Amino acid sequence: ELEELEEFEFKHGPMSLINDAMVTRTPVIISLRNNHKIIARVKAFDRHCNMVLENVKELWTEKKGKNVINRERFISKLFLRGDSVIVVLKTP
Amino acid sequence: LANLIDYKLRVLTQDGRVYIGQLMAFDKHMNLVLNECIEERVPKVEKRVLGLTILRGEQILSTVVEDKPL
Amino acid sequence: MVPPINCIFNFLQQQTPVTIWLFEQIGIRIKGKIVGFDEFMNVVIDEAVEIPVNVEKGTPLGKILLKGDNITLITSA
Amino acid sequence: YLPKKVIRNYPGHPEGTTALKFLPKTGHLILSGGNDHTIKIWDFYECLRDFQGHNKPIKALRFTEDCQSFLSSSFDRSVKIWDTETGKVKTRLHLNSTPADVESRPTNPHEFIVGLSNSKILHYDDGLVQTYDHHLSSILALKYFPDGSKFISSSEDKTVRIWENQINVPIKQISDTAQHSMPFLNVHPSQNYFCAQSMDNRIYSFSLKPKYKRHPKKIFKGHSSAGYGISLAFSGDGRYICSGDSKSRLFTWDWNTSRLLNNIKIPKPITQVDWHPQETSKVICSGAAGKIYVC
Amino acid sequence: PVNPKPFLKGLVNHRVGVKLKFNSTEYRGTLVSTDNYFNLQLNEAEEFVAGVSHGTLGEIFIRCNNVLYIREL
Amino acid sequence: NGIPVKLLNEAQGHIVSLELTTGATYRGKLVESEDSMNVQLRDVIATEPQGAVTHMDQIFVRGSQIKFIVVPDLLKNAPLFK
Amino acid sequence: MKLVNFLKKLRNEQVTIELKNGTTVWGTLQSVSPQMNAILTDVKLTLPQPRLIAMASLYLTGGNIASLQYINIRGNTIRQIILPDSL
Amino acid sequence: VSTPELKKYMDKKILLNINGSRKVAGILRGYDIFLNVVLDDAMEINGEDPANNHQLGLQTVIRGNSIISLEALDA
RNA sequence: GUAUGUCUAAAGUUAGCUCUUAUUUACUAACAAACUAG
RNA sequence: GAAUCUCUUUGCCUUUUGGCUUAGAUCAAGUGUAGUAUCUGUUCUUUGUAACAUGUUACAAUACCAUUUUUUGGCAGGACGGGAAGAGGAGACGUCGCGACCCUCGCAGGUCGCUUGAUGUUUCUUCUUCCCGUUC
Numbered sequence A: 001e002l003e004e005l006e007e008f009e010f011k012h013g014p015m016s017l018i019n020d021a022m023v024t025r026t027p028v029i030i031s032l033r034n035n036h037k038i039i040a041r042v043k044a045f046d047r048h049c050n051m052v053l054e055n056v057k058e059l060w061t062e063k064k065g066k067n068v069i070n071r072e073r074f075i076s077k078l079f080l081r082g083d084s085v086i087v088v089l090k091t092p
Numbered sequence B: 001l002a003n004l005i006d007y008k009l010r011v012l013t014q015d016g017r018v019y020i021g022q023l024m025a026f027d028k029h030m031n032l033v034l035n036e037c038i039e040e041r042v043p044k045v046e047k048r049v050l051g052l053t054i055l056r057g058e059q060i061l062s063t064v065v066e067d068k069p070l
Numbered sequence C: 001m002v003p004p005i006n007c008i009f010n011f012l013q014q015q016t017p018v019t020i021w022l023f024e025q026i027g028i029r030i031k032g033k034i035v036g037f038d039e040f041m042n043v044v045i046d047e048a049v050e051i052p053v054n055v056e057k058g059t060p061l062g063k064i065l066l067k068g069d070n071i072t073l074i075t076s077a
Numbered sequence D: 001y002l003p004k005k006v007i008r009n010y011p012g013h014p015e016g017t018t019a020l021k022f023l024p025k026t027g028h029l030i031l032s033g034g035n036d037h038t039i040k041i042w043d044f045y046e047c048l049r050d051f052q053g054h055n056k057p058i059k060a061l062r063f064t065e066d067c068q069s070f071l072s073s074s075f076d077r078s079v080k081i082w083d084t085e086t087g088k089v090k091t092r093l094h095l096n097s098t099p100a101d102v103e104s105r106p107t108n109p110h111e112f113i114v115g116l117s118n119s120k121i122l123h124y125d126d127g128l129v130q131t132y133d134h135h136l137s138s139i140l141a142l143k144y145f146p147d148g149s150k151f152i153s154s155s156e157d158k159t160v161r162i163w164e165n166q167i168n169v170p171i172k173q174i175s176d177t178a179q180h181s182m183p184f185l186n187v188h189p190s191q192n193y194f195c196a197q198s199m200d201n202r203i204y205s206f207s208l209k210p211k212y213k214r215h216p217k218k219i220f221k222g223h224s225s226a227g228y229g230i231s232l233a234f235s236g237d238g239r240y241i242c243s244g245d246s247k248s249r250l251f252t253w254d255w256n257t258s259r260l261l262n263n264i265k266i267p268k269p270i271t272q273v274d275w276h277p278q279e280t281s282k283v284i285c286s287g288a289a290g291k292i293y294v295c
Numbered sequence E: 001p002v003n004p005k006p007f008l009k010g011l012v013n014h015r016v017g018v019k020l021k022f023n024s025t026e027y028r029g030t031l032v033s034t035d036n037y038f039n040l041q042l043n044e045a046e047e048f049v050a051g052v053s054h055g056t057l058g059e060i061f062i063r064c065n066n067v068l069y070i071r072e073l
Numbered sequence F: 001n002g003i004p005v006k007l008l009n010e011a012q013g014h015i016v017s018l019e020l021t022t023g024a025t026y027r028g029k030l031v032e033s034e035d036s037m038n039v040q041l042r043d044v045i046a047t048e049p050q051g052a053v054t055h056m057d058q059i060f061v062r063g064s065q066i067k068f069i070v071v072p073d074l075l076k077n078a079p080l081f082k
Numbered sequence G: 001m002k003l004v005n006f007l008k009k010l011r012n013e014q015v016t017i018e019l020k021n022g023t024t025v026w027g028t029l030q031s032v033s034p035q036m037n038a039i040l041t042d043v044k045l046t047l048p049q050p051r052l053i054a055m056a057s058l059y060l061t062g063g064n065i066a067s068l069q070y071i072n073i074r075g076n077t078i079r080q081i082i083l084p085d086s087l
Numbered sequence H: 001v002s003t004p005e006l007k008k009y010m011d012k013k014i015l016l017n018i019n020g021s022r023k024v025a026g027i028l029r030g031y032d033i034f035l036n037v038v039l040d041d042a043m044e045i046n047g048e049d050p051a052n053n054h055q056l057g058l059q060t061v062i063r064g065n066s067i068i069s070l071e072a073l074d075a
Numbered sequence I: 001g002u003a004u005g006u007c008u009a010a011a012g013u014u015a016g017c018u019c020u021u022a023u024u025u026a027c028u029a030a031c032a033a034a035c036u037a038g
Numbered sequence J: 001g002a003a004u005c006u007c008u009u010u011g012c013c014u015u016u017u018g019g020c021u022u023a024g025a026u027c028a029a030g031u032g033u034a035g036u037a038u039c040u041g042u043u044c045u046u047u048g049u050a051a052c053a054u055g056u057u058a059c060a061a062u063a064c065c066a067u068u069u070u071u072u073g074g075c076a077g078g079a080c081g082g083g084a085a086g087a088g089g090a091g092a093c094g095u096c097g098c099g100a101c102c103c104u105c106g107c108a109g110g111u112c113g114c115u116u117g118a119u120g121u122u123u124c125u126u127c128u129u130c131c132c133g134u135u136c
Ligand SMILES: [Mg+2]
Pocket: I038
């Protein structure tokens, strides 16, 4: 029984918020390594925190020679490498 | 990629340097070996000829195919 | 003639105050006392004091588990 | 790991191929001394050369740890040291008796030991150096210690004598009332055990201690090794034992329980058995056929 | 000799602080769960930007790839 | 095994060039190559990225700081055509 | 399960891959590796906005929007690949 | 893993350069499979021109992910 | 130490357990501080 | 009803004591070295699919985030170009080139100028006039 020791440490370990956001279908905000804050819903979780998202609302920052402006785009379907993942934060 | 053996590979490494050479072999880690490889930095301009070189898959960002064989 | 996992633990038995360097961050160093470690050099340290390299101050941080992937160079005093 | 299938052909002599060994730590070559013809080398598949200069069959073909030249023990009273690269004449020991296995000390290419069948053993350099006369019978097989510096001899008598680096006098002579003989013996590669065939169809295993006494239950019984000069073998870092028999069968063995594992039906008495120092599961065997079946 | 997995699972339910590898961001909160591979899960997380507070965030996860250290306050 | 590592193991006794991930180039005679692409390099002439050129007796660079090695061109005939 | 096998469902799918250097790849996957290394075809890559290193890489190819017939990308360099909205 | 053969460098004054462009001289006491290098007689070579004698006999150790390369000062 | 016993190509016959390691004890020695055998 | 196989018991002795006399006779009084044998003490362990002539090749299934590789030490008329002239880009370190008074002399590029040759680190702080191309 290899998988049950894999999945129950998965269950109440640090992968809970990626497992809880998806089950309750609540958007979690994800800040990546290049400051692309991503607020989105979760479709699936992986070992590497690879994530498939839905209705992605990526928000980033562009700096120029005056007041910084905010650039944001809506991505309907997204697959995300877990390497950029810093913070998974669930909003209530 | 085993399909892509013995072609000229325009392979783009991490620092923006681009290698062009004939693919001798690859492996699991994408370690590449390049016959008559040339190295160019800033992009015809700024090119260096290396010859039979290795290229470790740690540094490759992408590889594209340049030309057919003989 | 000492492999390094046997050369971490002599900081641990003798309980020496230890200066530890970070990895690609040269402005800050950490000094403290080695209280625990593992096989991947993730180090728990006691009496942890930051060292701004650029007069060398300190902010006392006490108990720190420093994750080993930023650990560079292990010394003492 | 265990050998289980008879994989490759390697058709050597149509005669016996009476000696098989490996280059130590570089499993590239083998050796094969047939009855009528001369020595052949197979690779891995390929062939390299003959070694003309023999007339009679060959008992054993032992390398050095310098590995450039092996040592031929022919029945024709002549010991020849052949290079594996060119195959030239270093020495030609014309002897008095039919020599047994002819071995070399792991330190020097100079130091070089020839067993005889007139109960003597002669040490040499690059040219007699020192005799050895304590066996009463024809001497059958020889070994050494880790990195040499001592020496192991066993005969048609039941005795095994540990001689030293150029010293006549045995430290231990190993004899009981029930031992047949010790016709062949190889060092277990942890360099602390002492395995040897014996013609009660059994492979005894002694220690390499000052208190040199044997250890019980490490005796490998299920054989027909009674009337043939059959070899022993050892895997990488000592995981198993392979040994041929006269049933045209090869028998492998464990260590802690020492029980039968694979009774293969290889197509004539299987005598010469070697492992690879590189491939951790495959075993080269040859009987009296000449076709070198690899398991 | 507090080894790290004995150190940190005993450090569960304590208001711990975590400095990231970027030093632009820290997080203070109660550590809820930690696997063998040192992923962190903090509740009532307050974000500390350059040592000064950014704001209250809530139930948070921190990847293993960014934990510079972790401290007990 | 790995064919590039097998290629680099045959490059022993040969003069190579090793450019490092910070940018410095190490031209020297490759005598010992490890399986993890670690290389012991003798009589090395070394060049900084800014251009500072030195010669050294023995250099030993780890695997994960190597950009690329350049083996001499005799190797590409055999035994790696198959 | 293993979401590497999730990408193996994406053969002949018209995706937009974003890389770590800011490279935005737009094309169709022919196949993907178990180490997520993605081969692609009929793909032109843009280096969005900025115009401010990587950029050199785009010019390295016959490429700023440059299109190459066959492109193989190391899987460690992918930040995120956007899949077709109909899936 | 193969053992990285630095037995030629045992008890030898070597010169480790380190990420962040750090340079540390020392005498090798030990290594491992991750090339974590133990140095007797630690000498931190800082930037301009001091030479910080760091651990003269207390056998420092450097983690293998931060080791760029090493020059044996002797043969 | 005898009795006595055994070996010895010059000559070619036709196709609980596995282990390292030390102390102790027992039996043996014409081995040592000019000679003693059934 | 005729008989085979397995047991139990009995009978045969089945590897089943093969001379004599004064029980035939008398029993260490060391050590060291060594050999043999044994005990005790001590430490470790517990497959389908396709193509070609049984073989070969190709593609999938099964077997797999911790420092050297793939689960990131990351981030922060008008315009344009070139060449020349006048008025208020420059110095280092190397790395390859156009000339040569030089070297060198044969079939298996080193040195010196550049009299405004190219090029990457590293510190500091534009306007006017003419000529030639592109665009509206
Ligand atoms: Mg008598």
